[PDB]
Amino acid sequence: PSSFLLVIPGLESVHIWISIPFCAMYLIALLGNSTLLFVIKLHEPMYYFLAMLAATDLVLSTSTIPKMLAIFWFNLKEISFDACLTQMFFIHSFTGMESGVLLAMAFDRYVAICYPLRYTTILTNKVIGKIGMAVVLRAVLLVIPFPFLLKRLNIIPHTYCEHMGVAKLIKVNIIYGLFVALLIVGLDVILIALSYVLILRAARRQLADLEDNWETLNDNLKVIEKADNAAQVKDALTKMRAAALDAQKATFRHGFDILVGQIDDALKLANEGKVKEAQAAAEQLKTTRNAYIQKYLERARSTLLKALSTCGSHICVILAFYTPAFFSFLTHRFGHHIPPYIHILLANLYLLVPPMLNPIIY
């Protein structure tokens, strides 16, 4: 054929009033993405992925709104076949890229949290570029067969060319449509969950190690205070020196050196077979312990947590982009009693509101 006659079919009476929210959302998304890209023109990998996400999102949003606005206002409902194929390919490819970018952001957050000292040496401009190129190539390759398969084989009740909607004009295309969903979207869920469980599993042992060190130094010291033999004092002081060394390594800096020096001075006296002097030195060390042990451990608990609050903003994007997808999937498989115009409005909203929400969050 030459042209397709697009048509909200139920609400065909009033159409001007429906276009106000869509125009407002498009303007907001365009302005937000433009500002986000302009502000960078912060050289960190996470910001690079955020910029790529914003650019892909803006280009996706600009590829669907104008046709709907023109249909609503000017009532020009004719689309060339080439335009329909182009719009289909662009929409699907950009959704895939957005998912890939989210996955890359999750990986960057994981490598930041679990390895804070090797974050720069692992992520290099070359490796980041290779990852981005791989994501783009995977999305393009997986989205390339759709136009060819459709071209292998005149009213659309919609506002843009959707592959599932166009295919109704059967039992084979749906298999590939389901396979691609579980390769660029289904795998993203699994990888993000695995990258979040590993992050949350990390905070648990780093804090546990410091807690263990504090408990063992305190507990052991009580034993030294209640000490009765030349051997026991030495056996406890050696463990004290080891624990202090490890705790200072794990990192209020000098204070660890002072505690270590006090432990060393106590060890020498016990080496010379004096019990009272060792007990006195141990009691003296408790002063520096209370002076620096109390303050370091107080900040230690608050310290581990701050790194988990940098990952909080990235959870909102997932919640705002995946949950609408799940709602759309549920309404596209069990939504029979609802009239079709509700289906059209819901699909438009689920496709359009992530572009609105993303720039406002970041």
Residue numbers in the entry: 11 to 17, 19 to 52, 57 to 168, 174 to 189, 194 to 226, 996 to 1044, 1061 to 1113, 237 to 294
Copied sentences from the primary study:
Several subtypes of the human OR52 family, including OR52A5, OR52B2, OR52E1, OR52E8, and OR52L1, are known to recognize carboxylic acids, and the consensus OR52 (OR52cs), representing 26 members of the human OR52 family, is also responsive to carboxylic acid odorants.
To understand the mechanism by which a fatty acid odorant with a long hydrocarbon tail reaches the ligand-binding pocket, we aimed to determine the structure of OR52cs in the apo state, without a bound ligand. The four-helical bundle fusion partner of thermostabilized apocytochrome b562 (bRIL) was inserted into ICL3 of OR52cs (OR52cs-bRIL). This chimeric protein, which showed neither basal activity nor OCA-induced activity, was purified in complex with a Fab recognizing bRIL for the cryo-EM study. To date, only a few class A GPCR structures have been reported in the apo state, such as structures of rhodopsin and constitutively active GPR52, likely due to the structural flexibility of class A GPCRs in the absence of ligand. With a large dataset, extensive 3D classification, and local refinement of the receptor, we successfully obtained a cryo-EM map at approximately 4 Å for model building of the apo state OR52cs. The apo structure of OR52cs reveals a large opening between transmembrane helices (TMs) 5 and 6. In the apo state, the extracellular segment of TM6 (residues 255-266) makes only a few contacts with TM7 residues, whereas the intracellular segment of TM6 (residues 237-254) forms close contacts with residues on TM5. C2436.37 and H2466.40 form close contacts with Y2205.58, and I2506.44 interacts with I2165.54. In the middle of TM6, Y2546.48 forms hydrogen bonds with S1143.40. All-atom MD simulations of the apo state OR52cs showed considerable fluctuations in the distance between TM5 and TM6, whereas the distance between these helices remained stable in the active state.
